[PDB]
Design a protein around this ligand. Structure first.
Ligand SMILES: *[C@@H]1O[C@H](CO)[C@@H](O)[C@H](O)[C@H]1NC(C)=O
Lengths: 40, 380, 125, 49
């Protein structure tokens, strides 16, 4: 975010929540391995 | 044969009609109040000064009038200094102001208590500059203690030329913030205009909550926003179930529209009601002064209001005391005054807008706060 | 009213004076009607009122620029109800515009950043 | 009927109304204009002529 902007801290907390409730991890698993072209 | 002065806004007729009805109704065998009426633009300080001076040169014993935020201090200062009693429907001044009898009950407590009743956290507050900013200060001060997030927007700067555009812009901005709760502290005309604009922007749909804060809840038209579904709450000063009110309703509805302007209505605006009740209060005040065997007469003419050093007239004190001690039954319910001229013991009907029509969900008293009065698909 | 009319009787061509939240409309309306000019150090009127010359500049834009300059998101605002609500109305409307969280307190009867709109006397208290 | 439409708040976006009449600007387009819904109708009288 641009320095001193209003969005920085709330999007920060949003990122916190998303990491805690497993959204980031699930999304990660979705885009990397699950959409994967070969095996496991 | 009591000389009384009066000051009316050139734009509001029904108040004068209600005043005349009060004159006819409360007139008695022994004495009859003689009004001297001046129609003038209320917001003008000069006009108010000259009106008051003309009324004072005739030596009227008391003055019934309306004032505006721009005209109020001239009135409070003049009446305070020259010892003339002022009786008004207008918004009560916040303070110690002497020689003013304010017919209107205080709306702040009911408003705040209602905000607490719905458990609102974040809401919007639209304030009109002309009706006074006291309640703005109220909801902000209380928002400081209550953790409330409040967006306060001044709606009173709008031009005659640009009306719909400003409201559309404002509600577009409130649509961006997606705030579903709106509080309107405004005069009834502006209330209805803003309402029309809301209806046009279609924000009266379900999921929205509106609070119209004034005693004019049924004065403004709730019919167009009735089928809308967005819950609307307001404050009613006049309970139509009460017998006195009903009698006033038959009399009011009976009147020929031509003789008394806007009288034919089945419902009466609250300002006019307060006017009528003010006539009552003045009559009873002078009857009270009569039963104390106090001489109401002034031995000489009061003279110029600007004469220096200012000459206060003596009897006016006794008049003021009389008007303040008055306790009567009227359209507004129990009528009583403290020393400042404010109403006390008053009660306000808390009303919610429902499909069938306006209903009374509760009531509010200064001592009692918010009080609720208790008021299909098969399942497998 | 007394003093101004006293000066009008003396036939002054213009008047230099002060006003307060209570008396300002008297001066504006009377100067407007009598077409006599009023010159004042006091706060600017909220409107276009004629025959009034304000020696004081309006402070609102400067203030907003300053609050925008320190990049204040949420802050606290203390207004003196005796001086006027003009700048308060301003900062609140512009807060609604700029996505500010403003705590407005009437001191005339939690955030670390406090804006004092007051006469110099109250600030010390 | 349009009055009723605006009363029920069906003039919000996602809604589309078609007025079939020789008049269009004849009736009021203004109250339903800011509604957000899309309205279409046909006029026989062209004020351009
Ligand atoms: C308070 O109001 C009640 C009615 O609710 C009335 O009986 C009583 O006299 C009032 N008290 C006053 C006017 O001091």
């Amino acid at each position: 975010t641009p320095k001193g902007s209003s969005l920085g801290t709330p999007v920060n907390l949003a990122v916190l929540k998303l990491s805690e409730q497993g959204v980031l991890d699930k999304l990660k698993n979705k885009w990397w391995y699950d959409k994967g072209e070969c095996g496991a | 044969s009591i000389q009384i002065g009066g000051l009316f806004p050139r734009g509001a007729d029904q108040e004068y009609s209600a005043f005349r009805v009060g004159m006819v109704q409360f007139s008695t065998s022994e004495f009859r109040l003689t009004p001297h009426i001046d129609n003038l633009e209320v917001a003008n300080s000069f006009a108010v000064t000259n009106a008051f001076c003309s009324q004072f040169s005739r030596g009227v014993y008391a003055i019934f009038g309306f004032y505006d935020k721009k005209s109020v201090n001239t009135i409070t200062s003049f009446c305070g200094t020259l010892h003339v009693s002022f009786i008004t429907p207008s918004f009560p001044t916040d303070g110690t102001h002497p020689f003013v009898i304010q017919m209107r009950p205080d709306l702040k407590g009911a408003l705040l208590s209602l905000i607490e009743y719905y458990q609102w956290d974040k809401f919007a507050y639209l304030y009109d500059s002309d009706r006074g900013l006291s309640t703005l200060q109220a909801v902000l001060d209380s928002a400081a203690e209550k953790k409330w997030q409040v967006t306060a927007i001044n709606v009173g700067n709008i031009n005659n030329d640009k009306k719909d555009e400003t409201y559309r812009s404002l509600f577009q901005d409130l649509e961006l913030k997606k705030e579903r709760r709106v509080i309107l502290d405004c005069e009834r005309d502006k209330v209805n205009d803003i309402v029309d604009q809301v209806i046009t922007i279609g924000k009266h749909v379900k999921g929205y909550h509106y609070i119209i804060a004034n005693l004019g809840f049924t004065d403004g038209d709730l019919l167009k926003i009735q089928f809308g579904g967005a819950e609307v709450s307001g404050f009613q000063i006049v309970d139509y179930d009460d017998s006195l009110v009903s009698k006033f309703i038959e009399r009011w509805s009976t009147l020929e529209e031509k003789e008394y302007p806007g009288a034919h209505t089945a419902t009466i605006k609250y300002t006019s009601a307060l006017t009528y009740d003010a006539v009552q209060v003045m009559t009873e005040a002078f009857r009270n002064l009569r039963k104390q065997r106090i001489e109401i007469s002034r031995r000489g003419n009061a003279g110029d209001c600007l004469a220096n050093p200012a000459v206060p007239w003596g009897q006016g004190v006794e008049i003021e005391r009389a008007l303040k001690q008055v306790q009567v039954e009227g359209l507004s319910g129990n009528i009583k005054f403290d020393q400042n001229g404010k109403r006390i013991n008053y009660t306000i009907n808390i009303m919610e807008l429902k499909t069938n029509g306006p209903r009374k969900i509760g009531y509010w008293s200064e001592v009692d706060k918010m009080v609720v009065t208790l008021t299909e698909q098969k399942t497998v």
